[PDB]
Amino acid sequence: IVGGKDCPKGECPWQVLLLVNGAQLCGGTLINTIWVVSAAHCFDKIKNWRNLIAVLGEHDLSEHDGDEQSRRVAQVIIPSTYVPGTTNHDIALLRLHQPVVLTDHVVPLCLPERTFSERTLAFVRFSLVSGWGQLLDRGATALVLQVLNVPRLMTQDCLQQSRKVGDSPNITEYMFCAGYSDGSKDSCKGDSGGPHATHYRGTWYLTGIVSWGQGCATVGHFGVYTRVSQYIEWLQKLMRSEPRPGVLLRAPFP
Amino acid sequence: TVAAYNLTWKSTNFKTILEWEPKPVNQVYTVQISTKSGDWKSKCFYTTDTECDLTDEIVKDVKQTYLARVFSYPAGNVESTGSAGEPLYENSPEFTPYLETNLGQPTIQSFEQVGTKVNVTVEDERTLVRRNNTFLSLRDVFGKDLIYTLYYWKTAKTNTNEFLIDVCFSVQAVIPSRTVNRKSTDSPVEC
Amino acid sequence: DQCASSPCQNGGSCKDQLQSYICFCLPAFEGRNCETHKDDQLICVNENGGCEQYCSDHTGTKRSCRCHEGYSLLADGVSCTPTVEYPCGKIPILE
Numbered sequence: 001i002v003g004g005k006d007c008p009k010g011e012c013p014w015q016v017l018l019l020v021n022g023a024q025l026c027g028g029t030l031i032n033t034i035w036v037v038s039a040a041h042c043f044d045k046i047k048n049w050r051n052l053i054a055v056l057g058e059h060d061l062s063e064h065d066g067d068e069q070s071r072r073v074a075q076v077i078i079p080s081t082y083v084p085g086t087t088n089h090d091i092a093l094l095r096l097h098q099p100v101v102l103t104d105h106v107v108p109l110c111l112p113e114r115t116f117s118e119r120t121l122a123f124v125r126f127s128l129v130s131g132w133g134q135l136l137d138r139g140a141t142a143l144v145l146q147v148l149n150v151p152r153l154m155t156q157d158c159l160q161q162s163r164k165v166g167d168s169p170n171i172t173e174y175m176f177c178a179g180y181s182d183g184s185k186d187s188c189k190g191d192s193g194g195p196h197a198t199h200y201r202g203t204w205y206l207t208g209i210v211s212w213g214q215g216c217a218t219v220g221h222f223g224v225y226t227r228v229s230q231y232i233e234w235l236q237k238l239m240r241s242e243p244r245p246g247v248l249l250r251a252p253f254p
Numbered sequence: 255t256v257a258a259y260n261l262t263w264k265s266t267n268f269k270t271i272l273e274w275e276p277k278p279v280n281q282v283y284t285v286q287i288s289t290k291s292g293d294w295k296s297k298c299f300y301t302t303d304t305e306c307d308l309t310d311e312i313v314k315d316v317k318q319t320y321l322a323r324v325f326s327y328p329a330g331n332v333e334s335t336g337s338a339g340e341p342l343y344e345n346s347p348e349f350t351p352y353l354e355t356n357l358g359q360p361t362i363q364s365f366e367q368v369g370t371k372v373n374v375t376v377e378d379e380r381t382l383v384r385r386n387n388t389f390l391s392l393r394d395v396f397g398k399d400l401i402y403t404l405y406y407w408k409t410a411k412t413n414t415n416e417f418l419i420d421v422c423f424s425v426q427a428v429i430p431s432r433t434v435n436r437k438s439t440d441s442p443v444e445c
Numbered sequence: 446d447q448c449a450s451s452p453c454q455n456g457g458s459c460k461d462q463l464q465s466y467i468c469f470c471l472p473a474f475e476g477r478n479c480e481t482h483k484d485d486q487l488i489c490v491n492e493n494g495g496c497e498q499y500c501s502d503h504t505g506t507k508r509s510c511r512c513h514e515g516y517s518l519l520a521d522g523v524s525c526t527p528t529v530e531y532p533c534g535k536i537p538i539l540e
């Protein structure tokens with residue numbers, strides 16, 4: 001997270017850090033006690049599926065305090081239309097082996113109804129992106145959880161204000177841009193999977209998920225995020241049906 | 255489906271209408287307005303008009319810069335797409351009411367005399383800017399920003415709604431600190 | 446008098462300009478000619494139909510507000526209130 005602040009402890013309660021073989025992978029958002037949304041790309045290169053942990057209530061990587069709860073991740077589900085190393089459909093649903101306990105420092109983010117996401121929340125200006133990922137494009141990853149407020153753009157604008165490049169991918173309908181084209185503020189690598197959360201009347205809801213960009217806070221470029229609302233019905237089906245038996249599951253999309 | 259073009263602001267005295275083209279062939283339009291950091295707020299829902307009054311939105315803060323955009327829908331969708339989600343729209347220019355609103359043609363409301371020195375008193379016009387439901391005067395909104403030019407039969411100036419001159423008139427609302435629409439149109443002529 | 450035809454409706458009044466006029470509307474109307482009833486566009490695309498959370502447009506009949514799991518609809522029929530302990534999307538240290 002480039003050009004943000006430390007999230008004051010407990011004010012980003014739905015942030016997950018995902019670790020593997022001990023080391024930082026990604027972030028996630030907690031949608032209820034066993035369900036965490038991330039990005040699918042976070043899982044392209046995974047070896048030890050066994051040691052895929054999910055930490056909630058965390059804040060200072062550097063020091064163990066009260067409030068961290070870790071949990072094995074029993075299943076990663078990625079949409080069936082997601083192709084490794086491509087930008088489209090960058091979303092995952094993680095089932096934990098055991099509920100986390102809701103506490104002041106672990107609280108879920110609402111997954112809104114689609115037509116609330118689409119007609120209302122998509123036109124609230126700012127929304128917070130957070131993580132423990134790189135603090136400058138090629139720089140050091142954070143230790144105290146980073147938060148950043150960004151503005152959302154409609155794809156038409158994101159296409160008008162962006163310096164073109166021979167193969168920066170399409171902004172598809174499962175994507176959306178937000179941030180700044182002036183180089184100051186963006187989300188970076190290892191923020192992937194983390195929340196873009198939108199504040200409306202007094203409750204936070206999940207509108208987008210950290211995904212991809214050209215570098216971080218590159219000039220003439222915006223952050224790209226998975227439009228979570230194109231996925232709401234699919235996630236919810238998955239949260240409602242009977243556990244299937246894999247670590248990696250490629251569930252159908254739409 | 256076709257997108258709005260020539261999005262123009264027709265603003266006089268803070269009464270502010272965004273017009274555009276084309277007249278709709280089996281599409282409807284909705285307009286949105288934000289300030290630069292604010293959320294978008296919809297207006298003129300699924301109209302077949304090519305205007306939209308945005309006064310009530312822009313007078314909520316005359317000094318802010320507003321952007322508006324005009325979406326385009328086939329009659330009886332909203333939706334979409336896609337190229338990539340999202341309904342077709344096009345953007346207005348930015349618009350800062352306080353600086354750019356056309357000053358309405360004034361009306362000289364008094365013309366009584368003190369002999370050789372004559373008093374012409376410009377009327378403190380009301381604007382569309384409400385406060386407790388009730389409209390604010392042209393002098394309320396601008397203050398020591400608005401001054402007057404006088405004509406007679408030759409030229410004279412004042413800040414206030416008062417001149418005193420020396421032996422038929424127009425005035426002019428003028429705001430000099432304005433990059434654009436600096437001078438109003440000439441009042442109607444009194445004798 | 447561009448105003449000669451009294452083009453300002455719903456009780457609002459006209460002020461002439463040169464080659465135009467201006468309607469001052471009473472609080473509940475907008476539009477160039479005061480044609481638009483502010484109280485008349487209670488639809489979900491309009492400011493979440495005034496709903497605190499979820500909104501539903503019903504054909505022929507007033508819209509309804511609804512809420513997320515762990516919230517229930519209040520008396521005013523617009524607001525929700527958590528019916529759980531840790532309701533999604535609120536920050537306990539901030540409450």
Ligand SMILES: *C[C@@](*)(O)[C@H](CCCNC(N)=[NH2+])NC(=O)[C@H](Cc1ccccc1)NC(=O)[C@H](N)Cc1ccccc1
Pocket residue numbers: 026039041042085086087133167168169186187188189190191192193210211212213214215216217222223224
């Ligand atoms: C998973 C993440 O942690 C990280 C988030 C970075 C977001 N950047 C900005 N500016 N908001 N994302 C990545 O590391 C992705 C991973 C990836 C996804 C799909 C295909 C390949 C890799 N990498 C990128 O974002 C690359 N810059 C992708 C790219 C951008 C422009 C041209 C070509 C590729």
Ligand SMILES: [Ca+2]
Pocket residue numbers: 058059060061062063064065068
């Ligand atoms: Ca810690």
